[PDB]
Ligand SMILES: Cc1cc2nc3c(=O)[nH]c(=O)nc-3n(C[C@H](O)[C@H](O)[C@H](O)COP(=O)(O)OP(=O)(O)OC[C@H]3O[C@@H](n4cnc5c(N)ncnc54)[C@H](O)[C@@H]3O)c2cc1C
Ligand SMILES: Cc1cc2nc3c(=O)[nH]c(=O)nc-3n(C[C@H](O)[C@H](O)[C@H](O)COP(=O)(O)OP(=O)(O)OC[C@H]3O[C@@H](n4cnc5c(N)ncnc54)[C@H](O)[C@@H]3O)c2cc1C
């Protein structure tokens with residue numbers, strides 16, 4: 001049969017499948033859906049005929065992501081410097097200043113203090129060890145309660161909250177402080193670095209690299225949703241919705257953490273993992289592309305709106321543009337366009353909304369979640385364990401990366417590790 | 426005779442003398458020079474007839490200095506908000522920006538890192554304990570060597586150095602890193618706070634408060650330089666240059682640390698103090714007032730010039746102003762006016778120097794030093810010990826304050842303590 005079956009056709013799965021193959025193994029890639037890429041997804045725009053857009057993962061930074069840089073280099077995939085912001089319309093109160101960093105000096109001493117406390121806590125985290133193994137339980141509290149102890153003033157406090165909401169894709173009352181600290185550590189112990197790293201984009205979309213990687217996997221089955229994995233025997237048996245079983249010495253689960261509860265594992269996974277695997281992670285990130293008329297180029301807005309961030313995405317024509325909001329799907333209904341007009345108009349009262357485009361990750365059975373973000377309490381109970389092997393079954397993907405949790409990079413990184421675990425044994 | 430003699434007629438000495446008196450004791454104040462105030466010294470300007478100027482200590486901040494605030498409140502001494510800076514002519518390289526905080530974002534991540542390390546080290550310091558008692562010897566190295574390990578880029582690195590030079594009144598190769606960290610801690614663990622606190626001035630000069638305080642001391646002898654203090658007997662004997670001895674149960678030395686080596690103490694001071702008392706501290710701060718024509722109002726310059734800082738001091742007329750440079754007297758000769766024109770012109774090539782005014786603290790036998798700043802090594806050998814009693818002799822003054830070393834505030838603070846030590850016993 002096969003040396004490995006890889007379940008799931010996103011970047012994690014794609015790298016694994018290609019790497020083992022180049023190692024000379026016999027590998028099958030099984031993809032539940034009708035395309036490769038998973039949460040990296042360029043398509044043509046619902047709003048603008050002829051325009052290609054990223055409806056998932058978009059932004060990379062080469063100094064922060066060596067594994068991604070080399071893929072881009074390996075296949076000559078051109079990147080482009082992401083949108084430079086030149087025009088600032090914040091909702092941060094009358095003392096904010098319209099710059100990218102809108103903190104007034106009247107606030108500077110407080111920022112300098114809070115920055116120190118913030119980074120002091122982040123320095124507690126050792127990245128390789130896992131969040132559940134370090135006595136961090138005091139920090140796994142709600143983000144809003146934590147940011148209350150920083151004694152921050154209006155502009156900087158609200159600025160902090162807005163970006164955290166955008167990044168974590170959770171309202172402050174649901175986001176774990178520990179997890180915010182984790183993203184800080186992931187970035188070489190930089191708060192600033194967490195935002196300064198959405199920095200480049202693919203010039204022809206993520207689909208570019210998706211194709212390069214697949215042009216090198218020989219056996220791929222789309223529309224093949226896995227429903228069971230069984231390793232009670234000498235050889236792992238992988239069973240499928242409408243179709244037969246496939247068999248292998250080794251199985252890589254490269255599907256989203258929040259999907260693992262819909263698969264039947266034999267034996268059942270280790271007791272420690274089950275509860276969290278059941279509940280899933282709390283990530284509710286929601287990314288909406290907005291077709292607008294009237295917006296000038298290079299707009300950036302941060303503020304206390306239901307959209308925390310709203311900024312320039314693309315030029316369409318000289319009257320028209322796409323913008324991007326982030327916010328979360330628990331707090332917002334993207335199908336109430338009335339609400340969208342309100343949210344936008346809040347920052348930019350002179351602009352007309354022509355239409356919106358997005359994908360509803362949380363509702364896609366193939367995904368069930370956008371990017372990972374633990375619920376409060378979850379990742380100090382179990383975290384590193386989640387992406388650890390259970391027998392001959394391996395778990396990879398951004399959702400479980402310890403080094404770069406959440407990013408294309410971490411999908412690439414958890415794969416390399418599995419490929420190694422297989423190759424060595 | 427007297428319950429106390431206070432030696433030295435600066436703020437430290439003035440508060441003591443007044444406080445003991447109000448306690449009802451019998452107190453003599455002995456002042457070596459021809460005025461009261463010491464290193465707080467307003468006079469009429471050498472350059473501008475009719476203009477009153479501060480040739481010593483000038484700047485206060487009420488939130489940072491409760492002891493000073495209450496003096497000002499006690500006597501209704503009016504302050505004025507110090508010069509707001511509106512115009513910026515830095516020498517920090519082509520990427521600096523002409524703002525008060527001239528760091529470019531291209532530099533921001535590095536600043537955020539360095540700020541963290543800087544404050545982490547400063548948090549090692551416990552203020553009450555004394556610098557010699559905490560295992561800080563690793564930090565008592567030269568400032569330039571320390572600032573090399575922060576890996577700072579041009580603008581921020583040079584900005585940091587310029588303000589440190591100004592503050593410590595020492596070139597980077599002679600200043601102790603530990604001492605820079607000490608000023609950071611003194612300020613509630615704030616780097617920013619070290620400069621944001623030169624913030625108010627006396628509207629009628631420091632002489633205002635000097636008079637208020639003396640209007641309440643009943644026995645004062647000027648031109649009375651002390652040369653010996655002897656406590657071998659039952660009652661302390663204090664002997665004078667051209668004149669008799671005075672006697673007291675208790676003596677307060679409120680004269681500058683760098684003068685104590687010219688006094689004969691019986692018995693000799695404790696072995697630990699003697700070496701440092703001999704060498705004196707390394708402070709070489711030099712403050713020059715420059716009368717100029719052509720300068721616009723509100724100028725501030727920071728840079729890599731021989732003047733680290735050069736900024737607006739006062740308006741004179743609509744063509745004329747005073748500015749203030751700081752720099753150090755080891756590195757600069759203020760009697761080479763050619764050099765002064767060069768230093769100024771470096772930042773402001775369009776401006777004409779009319780004249781300069783300053784006092785040469787380091788050369789004044791009554792002072793022998795401007796503000797305190799240890800030499801490298803000194804204050805981790807002995808620091809708290811220096812301002813500790815030796816028998817019935819007490820040492821006060823800014824030079825020895827642990828809480829606010831260097832400031833009028835710390836002169837007020839070390840006095841309160843002595844007054845207490847005397848009263849309790
Ligand atoms: C809105 C949004 C914006 C983002 N923006 C960025 C960004 O700017 N920068 C960045 O670095 N990252 C970004 N990300 C994160 C990044 O996209 C993902 O975390 C990463 O691409 C995940 O890749 P993966 O290989 O781990 O999982 P996925 O790409 O999710 O791949 C999992 C695959 O499994 C398949 N699958 C699911 N169930 C089964 C089944 N049982 N059987 C077979 N196949 C199955 C799915 O079809 C999918 O193809 C963003 C994510 C979202 C949701
Ligand atoms: C240029 C300069 C600028 C400054 N700027 C500021 C500022 O902006 N803000 C701030 O808070 N602080 C500032 N300071 C610091 C502050 O002025 C001093 O540290 C503080 O005033 C010292 O007061 P003191 O009472 O300890 O000593 P001093 O004021 O120095 O008093 C000592 C007194 O002892 C007398 N004396 C010396 N020898 C004898 C002798 N043997 N017998 C009798 N009397 C003797 C002297 O005449 C003097 O009056 C500045 C200092 C300088 C030099």
Ligand SMILES: CNCCCC(=O)c1ccc(O)nc1
Nearest residue numbers: 166167168371372405406407
């Ligand atoms: C845990 N990872 C949180 C970051 C989520 C994420 O990758 C992402 C990337 C870009 C953006 O604009 N918002 C969120």
Ligand SMILES: CNCCCC(=O)c1ccc(O)nc1
Nearest residue numbers: 591592593796797830831832
């Ligand atoms: C140890 N104290 C260092 C600060 C020296 C000092 O008090 C001072 C005050 C104002 C100024 O502009 N430069 C120096």
